[PDB]
């Protein structure tokens, strides 16, 4: 029922990254501001219980006065106070993270004279899960390309981790493909029908339990290492060409016991053995035994 910002900046004891500030507690930085009516709406890309995302044309957006297609996030006109706060919080975090080639970047915002609108990159080929499902063989794509996708998502995640940013909803539905079929990770909950998505299970909240690390499920702890677990599930999605994780198994008491016992999905049909080894490493029960995203990146490179 509550919206529901997944991205989170955490505190940093070790690692190469140090957290000086909590961005949601300062901005909003006005350098992002964009004239409201230099936007013309188009088709609705998606919608849910809290808002929607619409394709649009932006007239003279960046420093180069150019026109381009963009995706505009926004809340229902019925949105309550807290949820507008959550939207501003997502805005502030995206602005704090900076730009990277394998995330869905912030391009601007309209915060004055009407409802808050968040302007982010338009990715022409849509989300990764759908694209996978349309490129199945009987029962276009290629093994090189799946390795490209895996690498590009790992790069985006290495970038987030370097900012001490946790995602907490890493999954194929949250990966987009843009020109050149380059993968970009983001969070598109706003555009999704969460209330009716069986992949999100009722708790406190609505949680993607099948993508979640053991320690997130039982201890409600979230670190970059827990994102690594989820990335392994994402890998399984890619190399199964878009099968639902744990096919046929419903989330209930027996599932929770399985994962806690050390159950791991079997090797996907289209996964090379060494890629499966990445998944297995990602699913180590002890969090400090999992790889980091940069170690995944270098292995995927060595394997290419
Ligand atoms: N929130 C958000 C956000 C940020 N960018 C986008 C975006 O670019 N989305 C899409 C762009 C193009 C297409 C095209 C439009 C029709 N042609 C096929 C792909 C589909 C989408 C999707 C919207 C909702 C989530 C799944 C992907 N959504």
User: 169 catalytic, yes or no?
Assistant: yes
SS (H, E, C) 127-182: EHHHHHHCCCCCCCCCHHHHHHHHHHHHHHHHHHHHCCEECCCCCHHHEEEEHHHE
73 is in an annotated binding site: yes
Cβ partners under 8 Å of residue 164, min gap 6? 9, 10, 11, 12, 15, 17, 18, 19, 224
Structure tokens at 201: 């299970």
Contact of 19 with 12, CB cutoff 8 Å: yes
Which residue in the list 127, 169, 187, 227 is annotated as catalytic?
Answer: 169
> 76: part of which helix (H) or strand (E)?
none
Q: Which CATH superfamily is domain 123-300 in?
A: Transferase(Phosphotransferase) domain 1 (1.10.510.10)
Q: Which fold, 19-122? A: Phosphorylase Kinase; domain 1 (3.30.200)
Question: Where are the alpha helices (H) located in the chain, listed in sequence order?
Answer: 81-97, 128-133, 143-162, 214-218, 224-239, 253-261, 273-282, 293-302
- Measuring from atom 13 of ligand 1, which residue has the nearest CA? 126
- Chain breaks in the chain following residues, C–N > 2.5 Å: 139, 204
53 is in an annotated binding site: yes
For residue 1, with 0-12 CB atoms within 10 Å meaning exposed, 13-18 middle and 19 or more buried, which class applies? exposed
Cα distances (Å, whole numbers) of residue 152 to 99, 126, 144, 175: 15, 16, 12, 10
Distance from C-alpha of 247 to C-alpha of 264, rounded to nearest angstrom: 12
Q: Do domains 19-122 and 123-300 have the same CATH topology?
A: no
Structure tokens at 99: 């730009």
Contact of 228 with 282, CB cutoff 8 Å: yes
> Where are the chain's structural domains?
19-122, 123-300
Distance from C-alpha of 30 to C-alpha of 168, rounded to nearest angstrom: 28
């Amino acid at each position: 029922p509550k919206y529901q910002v997944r991205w989170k900046i955490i505190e940093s004891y070790e690692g190469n990254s140090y957290t000086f500030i909590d961005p949601t507690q300062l901005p909003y930085n006005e350098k992002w501001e964009f004239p409201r009516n230099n936007l013309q709406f188009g088709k609705t890309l998606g919608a849910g219980a809290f808002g929607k995302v619409v394709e649009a044309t932006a007239f003279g957006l960046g420093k180069e006065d150019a026109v381009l297609k963009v995706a505009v996030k926004m809340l229902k006109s019925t949105a309550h106070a807290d949820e507008k706060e959550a939207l501003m919080s997502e805005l502030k975090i995206m602005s704090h993270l900076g730009q990277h080639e394998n995330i869905v970047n912030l391009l601007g915002a309209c915060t004055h004279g009407g409802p808050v609108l968040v302007i982010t990159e338009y990715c022409c080929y849509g989300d990764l899960l759908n694209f996978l499902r349309r490129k199945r063989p009987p029962g276009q794509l290629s093994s090189r390309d799946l390795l490209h996708f895996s690498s590009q998502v790992a790069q985006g995640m290495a970038f987030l981790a370097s900012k001490n940013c946790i995602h907490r909803d890493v999954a194929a539905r949250n990966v987009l493909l843009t020109n050149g079929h380059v993968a970009k990770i983001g969070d598109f909950g706003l555009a999704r029908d969460i209330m009716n998505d069986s992949n999100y299970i009722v708790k406190g909240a609505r949680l993607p339990v099948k993508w979640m690390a053991p320690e997130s499920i039982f201890d409600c702890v979230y670190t970059v290492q827990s994102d690594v677990w989820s990335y392994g599930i994402l890998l399984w999605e890619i190399f199964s060409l878009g099968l639902n994780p744990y096919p046929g198994i419903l989330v209930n008491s027996k599932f929770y016991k399985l994962v806690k016992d050390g159950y791991q999905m079997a090797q996907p049909a289209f996964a090379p053995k060494n890629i499966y080894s990445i998944m297995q490493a990602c699913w180590a029960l002890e969090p400090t035994h999992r790889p980091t995203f940069q170690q995944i990146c270098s292995f995927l490179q060595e394997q290419a």
